[PDB]
Swiss-Prot record, chains A, B:
<feature type="cross-link" description="Glycyl lysine isopeptide (Lys-Gly) (interchain with G-Cter in ubiquitin)">
    <location>
        <position position="181"/>
    </location>
</feature>
<feature type="cross-link" description="Glycyl lysine isopeptide (Lys-Gly) (interchain with G-Cter in ubiquitin)">
    <location>
        <position position="180"/>
    </location>
</feature>
<feature type="modified residue" description="Phosphoserine">
    <location>
        <position position="200"/>
    </location>
</feature>
<feature type="modified residue" description="Phosphoserine; by TBK1">
    <location>
        <position position="62"/>
    </location>
</feature>
<feature type="modified residue" description="Phosphoserine">
    <location>
        <position position="70"/>
    </location>
</feature>
<comment type="similarity">
    <text>Belongs to the IRF family.</text>
</comment>
<feature type="modified residue" description="Phosphoserine; by IKKB">
    <location>
        <position position="215"/>
    </location>
</feature>
<comment type="subunit">
    <text>Homodimer, when phosphorylated. Interacts with TASL (via pLxIS motif); interaction takes place downstream of TLR7, TLR8 or TLR9, leading to its activation. Interacts with MYD88 and TRAF6.</text>
</comment>
<feature type="modified residue" description="Phosphoserine">
    <location>
        <position position="206"/>
    </location>
</feature>
<feature type="modified residue" description="Phosphoserine">
    <location>
        <position position="204"/>
    </location>
</feature>
<feature type="modified residue" description="Phosphoserine">
    <location>
        <position position="209"/>
    </location>
</feature>
<protein>
    <recommendedName>
        <fullName>Interferon regulatory factor 5</fullName>
    </recommendedName>
</protein>
<comment type="function">
    <text>Transcription factor that plays a critical role in innate immunity by activating expression of type I interferon (IFN) IFNA and INFB and inflammatory cytokines downstream of endolysosomal toll-like receptors TLR7, TLR8 and TLR9. Regulates the transcription of type I IFN genes (IFN-alpha and IFN-beta) and IFN-stimulated genes (ISG) by binding to an interferon-stimulated response element (ISRE) in their promoters. Can efficiently activate both the IFN-beta (IFNB) and the IFN-alpha (IFNA) genes and mediate their induction downstream of the TLR-activated, MyD88-dependent pathway.</text>
</comment>
Amino acid sequence: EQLLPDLLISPHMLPLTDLEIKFQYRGRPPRALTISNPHGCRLFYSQLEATQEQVELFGPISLEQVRFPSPEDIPSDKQRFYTNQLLDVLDRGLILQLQGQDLYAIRLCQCKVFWSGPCASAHDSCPNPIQREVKTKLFSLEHFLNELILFQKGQTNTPPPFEIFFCFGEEWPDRKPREKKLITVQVVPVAARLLLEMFSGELSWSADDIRLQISNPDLKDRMVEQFKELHHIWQS
Amino acid sequence: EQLLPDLLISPHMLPLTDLEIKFQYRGRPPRALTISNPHGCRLFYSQLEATQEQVELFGPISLEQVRFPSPEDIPSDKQRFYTNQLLDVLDRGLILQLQGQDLYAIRLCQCKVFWSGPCASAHDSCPNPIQREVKTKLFSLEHFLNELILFQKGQTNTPPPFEIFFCFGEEWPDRKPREKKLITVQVVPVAARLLLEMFSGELSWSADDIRLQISNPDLKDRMVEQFKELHHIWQS
């Protein structure tokens, strides 16, 4: 299994820079896109553009510039009011940048950002805010693949996590349900999902863990089987 | 709130017969469709067709006839071998039928069928097989809406469940992860999802439960705000 990372973590094997980004406003259908910019992206809401002279404010111009969706079609005025208050403090944005195969956040926005994800701390139960201007590791593909290997061998029953969950402007994790959060964003490293699928679809020749569950045939089953036999005969 | 069911449970308000049906083979992308046949549907795999003279075997001809996807593109021969053994005993199928706004299963297939869902029993932890030829209630929209009402009022923190999960040919629920199940199907009553969205997007005028989380502005925030002010000025 030691050859696997070198074999698989490669542009000819995986889309190493692809992130799927799903925006969700409370009570609306989600809106998703995929970016493959190798510098990463910046999620933000602004009338102003990132420029070279203002990188301190808005980050590097090479990031994929991904705007939060208009809240216009939020039917509740009260909800759209709160939502606009948050979007008003999202001008500087949340940078998501790949460093090798690790994904990092850099929060620039005045809006607070809270998150859940593969590298998030698991020592308490309270909210998990992202500190402004502090490079925060969200996900490691190296570690993901190590864990994937143990899962596939059946050494763990838990599939390794890859999805990163952000809540903008309200605390998370929380007692309260995600359905009631005004603004959330889910981010998937597509290479990780692909790798989980790939490994899930590889079984052992030796360790046959599979016990099919099939009733004994009743007379109805028997009639069906005979009809299948006759149909096979008739073909030809 | 007593007027709500009469108001909402109506064809002019909701798609009362729409089910989304998602097929998933281990390690493959899922494959989904939506049916809106008011009789319901039959999930099956067969070279034979439902006919009038064989309703005992294959169910009523009015059901939407939904075939499991070919397992051809499953890359593991061993996996596709087990998968074909299950598909070979799925000729008679699993009927999903609406009775008013309740959804019921009738298993005809020789393959065993196990499930998780809104009406599933919660007294033990073991597998939950569907009994062949026994009308099995999966979901109640009436009850869903009652629960939705309590959620929206904040009387419960848990959103009411609507998704029904079937595993064909292997035990469920189980120690083992769903990612390793050969054949699963997820079924959503679309009216229920719509209703959850609708209710989630209705807030109170009085019970304002929302505390926005926004840092104090630093000098960078202040410069951004001034640039926004200048841009608003410049517009016009």
